[PDB]
């Protein structure tokens, strides 16, 4: 019709911010923000694992142009972020992030 069911969507119109890829910490809370260039609809953020499990990340709406997504990066190698918007993977998705950092604490 005219006002209701819509065809295409605005998924590619999304930019990731404060996203850790080479500075993640195991057994530690890690959240990131998602910039919106004026794309409305639905937001989906889940964490994938090579073990065959799919966890759900906490998604809270703070700003009409910005969002927060917390997740616990716990894997045995590399993680794979999956972002969906109105049924479509945004640009540069999924995203890759290597957990770990060059250093020793203790």
Curated annotation (Swiss-Prot):
Sequence ranges of the Filamin repeats: 8-99
PTM description: ISGylation prevents ability to interact with the upstream activators of the JNK cascade and inhibits IFNA-induced JNK signaling.
Free-text tissue specificity from the UniProt record: Ubiquitous. Isoform 1 and isoform 2 are expressed in placenta, bone marrow, brain, umbilical vein endothelial cells (HUVEC), retina and skeletal muscle. Isoform 1 is predominantly expressed in prostate, uterus, liver, thyroid, stomach, lymph node, small intestine, spleen, skeletal muscle, kidney, placenta, pancreas, heart, lung, platelets, endothelial cells, megakaryocytic and erythroleukemic cell lines. Isoform 2 is predominantly expressed in spinal cord, platelet and Daudi cells.
Family, as annotated: Belongs to the filamin family.
Function: Connects cell membrane constituents to the actin cytoskeleton. May promote orthogonal branching of actin filaments and links actin filaments to membrane glycoproteins. Anchors various transmembrane proteins to the actin cytoskeleton. Interaction with FLNA may allow neuroblast migration from the ventricular zone into the cortical plate. Various interactions and localizations of isoforms affect myotube morphology and myogenesis. Isoform 6 accelerates muscle differentiation in vitro.
Comment field on protein domains: Comprised of a NH2-terminal actin-binding domain, 24 internally homologous repeats and two hinge regions. Repeat 24 and the second hinge domain are important for dimer formation. The first hinge region prevents binding to ITGA and ITGB subunits.
Subunit-structure text: Homodimer. Interacts with MICALL2. Interacts with RFLNA and RFLNB. Isoform 1 interacts with FBLP1, FLNA, FLNC, GP1BA, INPPL1, ITGB1A, PSEN1 and PSEN2. Isoform 3 interacts with ITGB1A, ITGB1D, ITGB3 and ITGB6. Interacts with MYOT and MYOZ1. Interacts with HBV capsid protein. Interacts with ASB2 isoform 1; the interaction targets FLNB for proteasomal degradation.
Noted disease: Interaction with FLNA may compensate for dysfunctional FLNA homodimer in the periventricular nodular heterotopia (PVNH) disorder. Atelosteogenesis 1: A lethal chondrodysplasia characterized by distal hypoplasia of the humeri and femurs, hypoplasia of the mid-thoracic spine, occasionally complete lack of ossification of single hand bones, and the finding in cartilage of multiple degenerated chondrocytes which are encapsulated in fibrous tissue.
Entry protein name: Filamin-B
Gene name for this UniProt entry: FLNB
Full protein: residues contained: 2284 to 2382 of 2602
